[model samples]
Target: RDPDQLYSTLKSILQQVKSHQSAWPFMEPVKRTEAPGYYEVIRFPMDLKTMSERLKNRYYVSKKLFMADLQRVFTNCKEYNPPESEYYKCANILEKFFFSKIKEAGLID
Candidate 1:
């Protein structure tokens, strides 16, 4: 690639990095030995209560995530959207996570 094209690509990538929050290095997931189940545990600089609170708040903050994803669909529609089942499964995962956290915190039924 030409120097100018390389520089443009680098600049684009850097903009993407700067525009997003950084994530911690993820820990590996744990699997059930007997049944089809799994769990993931990660270390964070927060207590479980505080972490649950943060998760509750941040799941709604996922408006940004949804907007970013949908914007990409609008701007680049070469590929089909993932099926409804996949979309609802993703929403269910998030809602269930939020529900579980709130329930554990005694904030919801």
Candidate 2:
């Protein structure tokens, strides 16, 4: 007979994932199907404060490994064991930089 521990652990894990579903809006990309779209889909603008490196963009865009590799790094965050402050700080820095370009950005606020 299996103990009830397995069932409880599974239940808790599922709840954790479900709770995080609405945490990030950017997780979903903007999709457009109509041609000659005259209107902006979103009110928020892209982050212009942070500049991208042309060479890195060229390398990643051509090789097409940016997404997969970046995803790997994100999923391996536990391996990094970053301090709680560091984790929060990282997100904060990116969000601030992202919102600075807009007068009243909705993306990060």
Candidate 3:
């Protein structure tokens, strides 16, 4: 209900995610050269860089939108990589971290 508070909250959550140990690999968009066929499977791509840009643009009008982007990161991670992969493992860790943090941030219902 409060845009100002929501903005700060989102920023803080983003900061936490970006600083995560496993976040190094996803700071930018996945390149097709490194990961072949990545673009083919994940049509809608997301990364911390774009998320930062979207926040700067104030593109997320609500928490729902912010949550969607974060969820997309995890969804695409699992879809493109296997469970045994480091990417997928980090995705699992960050997914839970995101969920728990949001719920405890006084923003979720």
Candidate 4:
């Protein structure tokens, strides 16, 4: 029963992330061909769409697990793109947004 509320809250959070305008870049998996050697650099690429699927599929048994993947998205963006690039900038901006939401939802301090 606790998991029911947990999953619902997470799903709501996921939708908010997906709805963000800056979420465009992280909405889908980065195609290797689209950006040569990206896959080699980012071993485990993540996107909101994939995260959403994982939530529904019950792949995330804990909120920390879900946040871990979300963090990866932010970290991977910084690692893969130029600091001056829009993608990198957006990642940081989005990270702040997620942090606030996570705190507001009482998922983290």
Candidate 5:
């Protein structure tokens, strides 16, 4: 069976790119125990350059296989559906905006 959750797909992608050291220095073993206590363990750098470079590299690191899996997830995963709430309007708007950005970036093309 395939992974259904978005988080699961993302984790799989990260795992596939784990061999790229420079692409994901954030996962360095040395940082596992460092920082603002155990409560906030996953500490990602605020530098956009680092993140962009890492993602771009990882985008190529896995090549066709990575993109294929991502496409499958994007196609198979249904849109977020929740019970009626006051925030529904804004949440839907944000979702559209998010996917729009992805398309705008050529990720969907």
Candidate 6:
């Protein structure tokens, strides 16, 4: 149950990232794991739309924990290390999206 919650939270982050891609399109052109065991340059606009259709509405236990888990995922010190070739740029965009959402929610000053 705990792991499942983490999975859902990560999925939520990905959707948020995709939604915010417009403001950071430059970071989208990179190798991505479109699905389990799948890999390619699948950052095109239409491709993201298709991916969005695959995602579902989900709930997270805590936004703070969600953000912390995201940091761990990106680092992969205790999990699968995702391809690093484009992760640095992707990480920056994700952080931008994350902080923007926090600001929108008035969670930070």
Best by lDDT: 4
> Highest TM-score: which candidate?
4
RMSD of each: 18.0, 18.0, 1.5, 1.4, 13.6, 9.5
How would you encode candidate 1's per-residue C-alpha lDDT over 1-109 as one tens digit per residue?
Answer: 4434433433343233223232111111222362133122222222123323333454323333323432332222112223353433433343344334334433311
Clashing pairs in 2: none
Off by more than 4 A, model 2 = 1-57, 62-64, 88-109
Tell me the whole-model lDDT of each prediction, alpha carbons only.
0.31, 0.30, 0.87, 0.88, 0.36, 0.45
Model 5: lowest-lDDT 10 consecutive positions: 72-81
Tens-digit per-residue lDDT, 1-109, candidate 3? 5877788899999999899887876789999899888888889999999999999899878888998998898888898888999999999888888877788797762
Of the candidates numbered 1 and 6, which has the greater TM-score value? 6
* 3 or 6, greater by lDDT: 3
TM-scores of the models, in the order given: 0.23, 0.23, 0.92, 0.94, 0.25, 0.39
Model 2: per-residue Cα lDDT over 1-109, one tens digit each: 1223433332333233223432232222223452123125233322111112222233333212322332332333223334464534443443443334222322111
Give the Å shift of residue 68 in candidate 3: 0.7
Please identify model 1 stretches exceeding 4 Å from their true place.
1-85
lDDT of 5 at 17: 40
Task: Report lDDT (Cα) of residue 79, candidate 1.
Answer: 24
Task: Pick the winner on TM-score between candidates 2 and 3.
Answer: 3
Question: For model 6, how does the per-residue alpha-carbon lDDT over 1-109 read when each residue is reduced to its tens digit?
Answer: 8646545545655567666644243223223443343233222222333333434433334556445544543343112335454545555666667667656554421
Count of residue pairs whose backbone atoms collide, per candidate: 0, 0, 0, 0, 0, 0
